[PDB]
Design an enzyme around this catalytic site. Structure first.
Site, mmCIF file in Angstrom:
data_model
loop_
_atom_site.group_PDB
_atom_site.id
_atom_site.type_symbol
_atom_site.label_atom_id
_atom_site.label_comp_id
_atom_site.label_asym_id
_atom_site.label_seq_id
_atom_site.Cartn_x
_atom_site.Cartn_y
_atom_site.Cartn_z
ATOM 1 N N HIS A 50 6.377 49.180 63.804
ATOM 2 C CA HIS A 50 5.233 49.366 62.924
ATOM 3 C C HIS A 50 5.587 50.355 61.828
ATOM 4 O O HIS A 50 6.548 51.127 61.931
ATOM 5 C CB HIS A 50 3.985 49.831 63.688
ATOM 6 C CG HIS A 50 4.203 51.080 64.481
ATOM 7 N ND1 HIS A 50 4.849 51.082 65.701
ATOM 8 C CD2 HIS A 50 3.875 52.373 64.225
ATOM 9 C CE1 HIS A 50 4.910 52.322 66.163
ATOM 10 N NE2 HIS A 50 4.323 53.124 65.289
ATOM 11 N N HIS A 69 9.560 51.663 62.672
ATOM 12 C CA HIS A 69 10.116 52.242 63.889
ATOM 13 C C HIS A 69 9.374 51.670 65.087
ATOM 14 O O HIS A 69 8.251 51.176 64.957
ATOM 15 C CB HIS A 69 9.985 53.762 63.875
ATOM 16 C CG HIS A 69 8.567 54.224 63.977
ATOM 17 N ND1 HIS A 69 7.690 54.161 62.917
ATOM 18 C CD2 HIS A 69 7.854 54.702 65.028
ATOM 19 C CE1 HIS A 69 6.505 54.609 63.300
ATOM 20 N NE2 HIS A 69 6.575 54.934 64.580
ATOM 21 N N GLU A 88 8.538 53.326 69.109
ATOM 22 C CA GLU A 88 8.416 54.667 69.669
ATOM 23 C C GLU A 88 9.689 55.054 70.417
ATOM 24 O O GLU A 88 10.471 54.202 70.840
ATOM 25 C CB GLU A 88 7.207 54.753 70.615
ATOM 26 C CG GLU A 88 5.871 54.451 69.950
ATOM 27 C CD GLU A 88 5.623 55.302 68.721
ATOM 28 O OE1 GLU A 88 5.471 56.523 68.854
ATOM 29 O OE2 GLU A 88 5.579 54.756 67.611
ATOM 30 N N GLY A 97 8.128 66.393 76.406
ATOM 31 C CA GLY A 97 7.017 66.583 75.490
ATOM 32 C C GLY A 97 6.539 65.350 74.759
ATOM 33 O O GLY A 97 5.862 65.477 73.736
ATOM 34 N N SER A 119 -2.244 61.645 67.764
ATOM 35 C CA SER A 119 -1.594 60.573 68.514
ATOM 36 C C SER A 119 -0.694 61.129 69.617
ATOM 37 O O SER A 119 -0.314 62.300 69.605
ATOM 38 C CB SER A 119 -0.801 59.662 67.574
ATOM 39 O OG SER A 119 0.390 60.301 67.231
ATOM 40 N N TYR A 127 -1.759 64.648 62.414
ATOM 41 C CA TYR A 127 -1.205 64.164 61.151
ATOM 42 C C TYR A 127 -2.272 64.285 60.071
ATOM 43 O O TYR A 127 -3.272 63.561 60.097
ATOM 44 C CB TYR A 127 -0.735 62.704 61.270
ATOM 45 C CG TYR A 127 0.384 62.474 62.270
ATOM 46 C CD1 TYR A 127 0.110 62.301 63.619
ATOM 47 C CD2 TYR A 127 1.717 62.413 61.856
ATOM 48 C CE1 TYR A 127 1.126 62.085 64.529
ATOM 49 C CE2 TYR A 127 2.749 62.198 62.772
ATOM 50 C CZ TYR A 127 2.445 62.036 64.104
ATOM 51 O OH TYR A 127 3.447 61.818 65.029
HETATM 52 C C1 LIG Z 1 3.085 59.852 69.374
HETATM 53 C C2 LIG Z 1 3.391 60.571 68.071
HETATM 54 N N1 LIG Z 1 4.823 60.527 67.821
HETATM 55 C C3 LIG Z 1 5.665 61.576 68.373
HETATM 56 C C4 LIG Z 1 6.082 62.569 67.294
HETATM 57 N N2 LIG Z 1 7.387 63.116 67.631
HETATM 58 C C5 LIG Z 1 8.424 62.150 67.318
HETATM 59 C C6 LIG Z 1 7.597 64.319 66.844
HETATM 60 C C7 LIG Z 1 5.418 59.445 67.040
HETATM 61 O O1 LIG Z 1 6.585 59.434 66.833
HETATM 62 C C8 LIG Z 1 4.555 58.317 66.456
HETATM 63 N N3 LIG Z 1 5.400 57.397 65.716
HETATM 64 C C9 LIG Z 1 5.337 57.780 64.302
HETATM 65 C C10 LIG Z 1 4.023 57.274 63.693
HETATM 66 C C11 LIG Z 1 3.355 58.021 62.733
HETATM 67 C C12 LIG Z 1 2.167 57.513 62.221
HETATM 68 C C13 LIG Z 1 1.438 58.316 61.162
HETATM 69 O O2 LIG Z 1 2.122 58.900 60.275
HETATM 70 O O3 LIG Z 1 0.180 58.379 61.186
HETATM 71 C C14 LIG Z 1 1.652 56.297 62.659
HETATM 72 C C15 LIG Z 1 2.386 55.622 63.616
HETATM 73 N N4 LIG Z 1 3.524 56.117 64.089
HETATM 74 NI NI NI Z 2 4.784 55.300 65.748
#
Ligand SMILES: CCN(/C=C/N(C)C)C(=O)CNCc1cc(C(=O)O)ccn1
Ligand code: NI
Ligand SMILES: [Cl-]
Ligand SMILES: [Zn+2]
Length: 338
Positions: free
Chosen positions: A269, A181, A183, A163, A281, A170
């Site tokens: 980032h 973090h 990804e 997934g 995203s 958001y």
């Molecule tokens: C692709 C979306 N995703 C997957 C979410 N699962 C971990 C639940 C992420 O982890 C994205 N990484 C966190 C994040 C969050 C933000 C935000 O809060 O907008 C900006 C950049 N990065």
């Molecule tokens: Ni991210």
């Protein structure tokens, strides 16, 4: 080549914009990945959704109240789950006096207020919501169906992607935060700001990510001894003042409504939302990512973090290294500039 590793902004014409996969190759040929983050401003004609009015009725099942603890640029976050909310009630909360954006002069002034006010009222984040709000039939840069290497492996080889190529929503308010973090599996991500107030980003070049990790290990040694990849918990906040003090190279940039941000493999980032907004995203992959996924440092303290088996990707796209890799003899260090 981008030798300063500064964050690039792209403004494609509509003709250049149509095919996301082709344009991403163009961005990397201009060295955009060396900053770990890039911005793409789509042409003004393009609209992923004609009207956002009915998003007000969308349900936020588990809003998150973010509790920040620490001082002077070093903080840890934890979450308290709140009761379900519709977007409309979340928007009214965000715009109330307790939660609204403070008055400010410019983005720099607002950035200062963010870091000064982290430990007062706890903001609430409608984060990590399953779904997309593109209109049906939008074929350009559709976050829900990007058709990358991740999709090929899922659809043609029948392999669970866990997934990570599905879209998330958001809904931010002022001071809501995403911590430092990369990804999962050190994948790419794409982020589109549908509407509302801006989102500010900090980025560390992949070629300096190990220095961020060493810095964080020294300041959060308890977190560190508990998990080799504790930054993946997304609970560690480090201010730009601290990074400047310890010589960690980084850049900043603010994403406005209607803009994409792309994060690249091993690009650390973090950032925060300016006010009520809504972003979408997903993660994705290219062939270039495969060598990152093969050495990505994984969370070793939680049972079911996101762990994708690399075998299919090495076998299909790196046939010359597959047996050497399974032998444990595929030794290399990643060139983050190529
Ligand atoms: C692709 C979306 N995703 C997957 C979410 N699962 C971990 C639940 C992420 O982890 C994205 N990484 C966190 C994040 C969050 C933000 C935000 O809060 O907008 C900006 C950049 N990065
Ligand atoms: Ni991210
Ligand atoms: Cl404030
Ligand atoms: Zn862990």
């Amino acid at each position: 080549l981008n030798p300063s590793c500064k964050i690039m902004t792209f403004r494609p014409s509509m003709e250049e914009f149509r095919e996301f996969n082709k344009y991403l190759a163009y961005m990397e040929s201009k060295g955009a990945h060396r900053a770990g983050l890039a911005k793409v401003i789509p042409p003004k004609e393009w609209k992923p959704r004609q009207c956002y009015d009915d998003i007000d009725n969308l349900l936020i099942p588990a809003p998150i109240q973010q509790m920040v603890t620490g001082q002077s640029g070093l903080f840890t976050q934890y979450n308290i789950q709140k009761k379900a909310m519709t977007v409309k009630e979340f928007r009214q909360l965000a715009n109330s006096g307790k939660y609204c954006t403070p008055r400010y002069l410019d983005y720099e002034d607002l950035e200062r207020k963010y870091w000064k006010n982290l430990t007062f009222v706890a903001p609430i984040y409608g984060a990590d919501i399953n779904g997309s709000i593109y209109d049906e039939g939008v074929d350009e840069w559709n976050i829900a169906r990007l058709n990358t290497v991740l999709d090929v492996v899922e659809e043609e080889c029948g392999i669970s992607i866990e997934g990570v190529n599905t879209p998330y929503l958001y809904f931010g308010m002022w001071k809501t935060t995403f911590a430092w973090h990369t990804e999962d599996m050190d994948l790419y991500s794409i982020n589109y700001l549908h509407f509302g107030e801006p989102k500010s980003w900090y980025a560390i070049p992949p070629e300096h990510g190990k220095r961020l990790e060493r810095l964080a290990q020294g300041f959060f040694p308890s977190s560190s001894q508990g998990c080799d990849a504790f930054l993946r918990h997304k609970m560690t906040l480090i201010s730009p003042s601290v990074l400047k003090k310890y010589g960690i190279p980084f850049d900043k940039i603010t994403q406005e409504a209607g803009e994409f941000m792309i994060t690249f493999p091993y690009g650390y980032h973090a950032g925060f939302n300016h006010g009520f907004n809504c972003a979408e995203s997903t993660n994705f992959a290219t062939v270039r990512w495969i060598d990152y996924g093969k050495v990505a440092k994984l969370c070793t303290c939680r049972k079911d973090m996101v762990k994708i088996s690399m075998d299919i990707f090495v076998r299909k796209f790196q046939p010359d290294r597959y047996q050497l890799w399974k032998q444990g003899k595929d030794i290399y260090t990643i060139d983050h500039t190529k």
